[PDB]
């Protein structure tokens, strides 16, 4: 199947004496595997998945040096944007970056990403050609022109087609057994009266990993849409996740409704019903 | 491994 790697980076300037907070998080197939935070007592890239313990000290040393360079880069970039937008000096501002690659099972690069946001809005992004830029506003045109003149896209293209692909491959080899790990959801239905002869049926899934999951309600073989509510999938805090989905139904008809739970850990989807 | 950005914004 496909695979992905991403580095999500944030620098947040602070109105006082402190330099910007800089954080970088790496993901392989959407699982956090490394992290750097400038606010840590000893700021350094750290392993966040067991399988990253295969890398020697030089890996962590040189990645750490890289983060230190990025931190300066973000500091300079924040200061430049503050001038481009004519913003006041004593505020707080957020610059973010997403970078990485999607790979096929044949290890072909399917798509490279290199994009930024300022104050929560898209700022600039490298196009799919890995050669040209899309700039969202006036300030970003300044950046675009600057990067066009210095040939910046070529450097990101090199990263995305070379290192990004090659290191993702290495990480998948080292992380294979752990990346395949699943915990199946445990499911049950709860029954909660509400006014005018109606009841909420809430279908729960608990203790599952990874977070991806689908819950559906059905009646008489048709999947439902109205009277329905889903909560965002949420961590339990112990590395597993939780979700529920609910439907409002007529009192006396509850047992006609069935919930289905779809999750990769399961040998097949769960189907269940209120069982009083 | 992470990107090492080139020219500043």
């Amino acid at each position, epitope marked *: 199947g496909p695979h992905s790697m991403r580095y999500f980076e944030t620098a947040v300037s602070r109105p006082g004496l402190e330099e910007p907070r800089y954080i970088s998080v790496g993901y392989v197939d959407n699982k956090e595997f490394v992290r750097f935070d400038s606010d840590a007592e000893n700021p350094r890239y750290e392993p966040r998945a067991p399988w990253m313990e295969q890398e020697g000290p030089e890996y962590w040393e040189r990645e750490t*040096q890289k983060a230190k*360079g990025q931190e*300066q880069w973000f500091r*300079v970039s924040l200061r430049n944007l503050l001038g481009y937008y004519n913003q006041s000096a004593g505020g707080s501002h957020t610059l973010q970056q997403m970078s990485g690659c999607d790979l096929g099972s044949d290890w072909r690069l399917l798509r490279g990403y290199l994009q930024f946001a300022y104050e929560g809005r898209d700022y600039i992004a490298l196009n799919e050609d890995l050669k040209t830029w899309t700039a969202a506003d006036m300030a970003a045109q300044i950046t675009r022109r600057k990067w066009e003149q210095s040939g910046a896209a070529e450097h990101y293209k090199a990263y995305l087609e070379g290192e990004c692909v090659e290191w993702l491959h290495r990480y998948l080899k080292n992380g294979n057994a752990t990346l395949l790990r699943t915990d199946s959801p445990k499911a049950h239905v709860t029954h909660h009266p509400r006014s005018k002869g109606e009841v909420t049926l809430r279908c729960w899934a608990l203790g599952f990993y990874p977070a991806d999951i689908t819950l559906t309600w059905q009646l008489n073989g048709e999947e439902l849409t109205q009277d329905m509510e889903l909560v965002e999938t949420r961590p339990a805090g112990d590395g597993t996740f939780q979700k529920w989905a609910s439907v409002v139904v007529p009192l006396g008809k509850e047992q006609n409704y069935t919930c289905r739970v779809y999750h990769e850990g399961l040998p097949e989807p769960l189907t269940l019903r209120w069982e009083p | 491994k992470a990107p090492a950005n080139f020219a500043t914004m």
Partner: T-cell receptor, first 110, second 112 residues
Framework: QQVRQSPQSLTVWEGGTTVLTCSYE??????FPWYQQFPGEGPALLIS?????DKKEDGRFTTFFNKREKKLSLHIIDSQPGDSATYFC??????????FGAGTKLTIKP | AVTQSPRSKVAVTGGKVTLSCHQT?????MYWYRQDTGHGLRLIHY???????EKGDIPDGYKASRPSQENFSLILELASLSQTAVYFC????????????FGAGTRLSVLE
């Protein structure tokens, strides 16, 4: 030392091709600029290449990169007296600090 | 532009020497390099922001000062014979792969 540049100086006849080479130790190095320094002036970026490429050409200057033997070179076709200068190869990885060779002083003579 | 001052300096052993550099590139990184008999570019000190400095590879015998974004000075408090060399200032945008823009150099001789 990580970037090895020889010879200390070299003469090439005018109109000949000058070949300047360097070797490097760190196989992860991925950016290789050359700087040219004329007498009494400071060094200035001449040409550069990324490790994903084999060659980069600009007018009479070509850089070649050979990853397998960890060798970089600079070719100057139809060498002019005005190409007389010190040439510095350099290498780095990522955003790490540049490592410069010791420089080769080139004199082109008729 | 990156401009150095003075162009040349002759100093007594044990004397104080300040080499100045001024850049108009609005660059954050500044550097001081040493070159010996036309060879090498050896990093002495550098600085990645106004009002602070960082030790380079051969800092010993040298201090640096970065009083503003534009200015980076190299200070030899007690000049020695072995500091006879040519010194180059540079700037760059951020660092790493960003091009170094160099001054035209300062020749120093230290004499008894």
């Amino acid at each position: 030392q990580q970037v090895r540049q020889s010879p200390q100086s070299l003469t090439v006849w005018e109109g000949g091709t000058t070949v300047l080479t360097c070797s490097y130790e760190d196989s992860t190095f991925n950016y290789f600029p050359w700087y040219q320094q004329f007498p009494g002036e400071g060094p200035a970026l001449l040409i550069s290449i990324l490790s994903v490429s084999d060659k980069k050409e600009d007018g009479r200057f070509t850089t070649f990169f050979n990853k397998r033997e960890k060798k970089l070179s600079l070719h100057i076709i139809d060498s002019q007296p005005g190409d007389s200068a010190t040439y510095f190869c350099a290498a780095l990885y990522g955003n790490e600090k540049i490592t410069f060779g010791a420089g080769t002083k080139l004199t082109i003579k008729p | 532009a990156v401009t150095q001052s003075p162009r040349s300096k002759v100093a007594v052993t044990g004397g104080k020497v300040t080499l100045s550099c001024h850049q108009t590139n609005n660059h954050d990184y500044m550097y001081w390099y040493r070159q010996d008999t036309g060879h090498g570019l050896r990093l002495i000190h550098y600085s990645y922001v106004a009002d602070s400095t960082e030790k380079g590879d051969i800092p010993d015998g040298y201090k640096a000062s970065r009083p503003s974004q534009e200015n980076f000075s190299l200070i030899l408090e007690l000049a020695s014979l072995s500091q006879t060399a040519v010194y180059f200032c540079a700037s760059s945008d951020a660092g790493g792969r960003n091009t170094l823009y160099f001054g035209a150099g300062t020749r120093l001789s230290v004499l008894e």
